Design a protein. Structure first.
Ligand SMILES: *[C@@H]1O[C@H](CO[C@@H]2O[C@@H](C)[C@@H](O)[C@@H](O)[C@@H]2O)[C@@H](O[C@@H]2O[C@H](CO)[C@@H](O)[C@H](O)[C@H]2NC(C)=O)[C@H](O)[C@H]1NC(C)=O
Ligand SMILES: *[C@@H]1O[C@H](CO[C@@H]2O[C@@H](C)[C@@H](O)[C@@H](O)[C@@H]2O)[C@@H](O[C@@H]2O[C@H](CO)[C@@H](O)[C@H](O)[C@H]2NC(C)=O)[C@H](O)[C@H]1NC(C)=O
Ligand SMILES: *[C@@H]1O[C@H](CO)[C@@H](O)[C@H](O)[C@H]1NC(C)=O
Ligand SMILES: *[C@@H]1O[C@H](CO)[C@@H](O)[C@H](O)[C@H]1NC(C)=O
Ligand SMILES: *[C@@H]1O[C@H](CO)[C@@H](O)[C@H](O)[C@H]1NC(C)=O
Ligand SMILES: C[N+](C)(C)CCO
Ligand SMILES: [Cl-]
Ligand SMILES: [Cl-]
Length: 523
């Protein structure tokens, strides 16, 4: 049907889902296309239109480099943009239950992709299942990534930094001002994302400007305190300048640098983003969030430590094998096409790839902590993966949770350990980074595809995620399920998610994280 929004009318399309119907509005604009003089600037308000805007298909995805490491492989290509790339990419999608709901809780998705890639139109971010099954309204948006989204010149409005985060914020505002018209409750909005998406959600919890645009938060495999999540003002400057040189835009006047960069084609900017860093890693985030003094008013770690953040409930979690996915993008001896049994020497070279500017002592300390074998040919293969996963995702997430809960709010932590039966990647990579997503969005609820055990697991996660959003408590109260306990700094209880048996456990990776959280920061 047609919904009247603050800026004009929009037309959706009906979709058949599980013997029912969901109304989708794909591609609603929420900001002025950031083209020309508007490139690198915070998103500007949109101008009211007349006629009926047709939101019947996904809009353009934002400019970004694509993963070409495995042409023709679904494992990597399922994450690549499935929509035309373009600077004109500030659009959002809405899925609403049918018949129209009266005051439905709203779930807003923020995709990940290291702040360099990603898009809301991916097959695995389809919100129709959630709308259909739990009667919630699902919203997702495209936000600028890479240099076009995070290039920074602190203090300069021509390129202030964090533009992609402000894109996200403008979309949350759109929901605040328009979701009622779709039958949604702007007072019951839960943000949820994965990877850089999760890091973005955690930053919205810290940004005063986002405080009133949402109720609760869900962080899947990511938080701002991850080593790859925030670019230092130092790195940012060197990077903006390196990009300038590489494009022949170096100028005495910094604003002239930007004007120059505003004449380059999106491709020239994308082509040179990779080289702005002397030596990067398969986890490098060339252009990401920075302390801009606007969206972020101080180093986020300080804000977290001193309780300066939105007080509300949070649901946080990570996957069993967060690090494996990155091993095949640079680690010697690794390949998705063999068991990747590596040697001590390869493990050591591996650390060089993942910890480039780290002292020799720092790398030895990582090896000492992870090589105290408990024989087996895959010891080193498994150790490098845990090293990358604990350092980059698991430990930062736990620390974030512990620090956040220390200020009074209920927090729930999960450990996702189920390996999709349809995973394209080899078994040795295990429960990979990004592969709990399809379960959260309820893809396994669709029988035409996944085992029965997977349908049941996805059905529970969906119910838990929905109950969290609506009631702030991730329980599944009807089918004699394990109760999900609150996570406290003392006992640190967490729930495991799998098909076998869900369990309550305590102090995840206790020994490993003491190393990363307490010691490693010093080297
Ligand atoms: C800050 O940037 C300099 C310059 O980086 C180089 O030039 C850029 C345009 C880009 O092309 C990069 O790939 C280049 O590396 C960094 O200095 C470089 O350091 C490396 C050390 O391996 C050296 O080989 C290069 O010759 C240096 N570049 C030059 C010409 O000075 C510098 O390391 C960066 N600062 C940091 C964060 O360390
Ligand atoms: C697992 O494969 C890696 C990657 O090698 C490539 O992919 C293979 C499947 C095969 O098609 C090779 O021809 C390709 O080169 C192997 O790593 C290579 O090992 C050789 C010798 O040890 C070394 O010279 C190369 O530099 C390595 N390449 C990389 C990227 O590290 C590895 O040996 C295989 N391990 C097995 C079979 O268990
Ligand atoms: C929007 O969709 C309607 C109905 O399909 C169509 O009549 C109209 O021309 C469309 N507007 C466009 C393509 O600008
Ligand atoms: C939706 O619920 C909120 C409380 O969460 C209430 O304040 C608001 O008036 C309701 N919206 C409707 C149905 O008008
Ligand atoms: C609860 O159990 C019923 C039947 O036993 C099943 O159909 C349903 O999917 C389950 N609900 C949840 C939320 O798991
Ligand atoms: C980070 N994503 C899951 C979005 C892409 C694959 O790593
Ligand atoms: Cl492709
Ligand atoms: Cl159970």
């Amino acid at each position: 049907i047609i919904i009247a929004t603050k800026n004009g009318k929009v037309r959706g399309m009906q979709l058949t889902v599980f013997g029912g119907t969901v109304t989708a509005f794909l591609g609603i604009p929420y900001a002025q296309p950031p083209l020309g003089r508007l490139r690198f600037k915070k998103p500007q308000s949109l101008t009211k239109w007349s006629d009926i805007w047709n939101a019947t298909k996904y809009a353009n995805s934002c400019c970004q480099n694509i993963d070409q490491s495995f042409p023709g492989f679904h494992g990597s290509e399922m994450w690549n943009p499935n929509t035309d790339l373009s600077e004109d990419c500030l659009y959002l999608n809405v899925w609403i239950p049918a018949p129209k709901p009266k005051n439905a809780t709203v779930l807003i998705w923020i995709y990940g992709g290291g702040f360099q890639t990603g898009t809301s139109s991916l097959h695995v971010y389809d919100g129709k299942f959630l709308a259909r099954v739990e009667r919630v309204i699902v919203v997702s948006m495209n936000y600028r990534v890479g240099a076009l989204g995070f290039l920074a010149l602190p203090g300069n409005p021509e390129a202030p930094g964090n533009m992609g985060l402000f894109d996200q914020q403008l979309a949350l505002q759109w929901v605040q001002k328009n979701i009622a018209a779709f039958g949604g409750n702007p007072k019951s909005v839960t943000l949820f994302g994965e990877s850089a998406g999760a890091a973005s959600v955690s930053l919205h919890l810290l940004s005063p400007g986002s405080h009133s645009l949402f109720t609760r938060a869900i962080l899947q495999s990511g938080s701002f305190n991850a080593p790859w999540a925030v670019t230092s003002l130092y790195e940012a400057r060197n990077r903006t300048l390196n990009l300038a040189k590489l494009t022949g835009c170096s100028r005495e006047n910094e604003t002239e640098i930007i004007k120059c960069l505003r004449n380059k084609d999106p491709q020239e900017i994308l082509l040179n983003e990779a080289f702005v860093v002397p030596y990067g890693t398969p986890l490098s985030v060339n252009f990401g969030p920075t302390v801009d003094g606007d969206f972020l008013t101080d180093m986020p770690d300080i804000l977290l430590e001193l309780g300066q953040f939105k007080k509300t409930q949070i649901l946080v979690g990570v996957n069993k094998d967060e690090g494996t996915a990155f091993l095949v993008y640079g680690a010697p001896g690794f390949s998705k096409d063999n068991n990747s049994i590596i040697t001590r020497k390869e493990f050591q070279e591996g650390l060089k790839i993942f910890f480039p500017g780290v002292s020799e002592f720092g790398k030895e300390s990582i090896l000492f902590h992870y090589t105290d074998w408990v024989q087996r040919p895959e010891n080193y293969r498994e150790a490098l993966g845990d090293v990358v996963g604990d350092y980059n995702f698991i430990c930062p997430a736990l620390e974030f949770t512990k620090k956040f809960s220390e200020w009074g709010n209920n927090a729930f932590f999960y450990y996702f350990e189920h390996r999709s039966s349809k995973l394209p990647w080899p078994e040795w990579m295990g429960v990979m980074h990004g592969y709990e997503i399809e379960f959260v969005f309820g893809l396994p609820l669709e029988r035409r595809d996944y085992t029965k055990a997977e349908e049941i697991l996805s059905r529970s996660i969906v119910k838990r995620w929905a109950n969290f959003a609506k009631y702030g408590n991730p329980q599944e109260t009807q089918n004699q399920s394990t109760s999900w306990p609150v996570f406290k700094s003392t006992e640190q209880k967490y729930l495991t998610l799998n098909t076998e048996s869900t369990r309550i456990m305590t102090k995840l990776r206790a020994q490993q994280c003491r190393f990363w959280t307490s010691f490693f920061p010093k080297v």
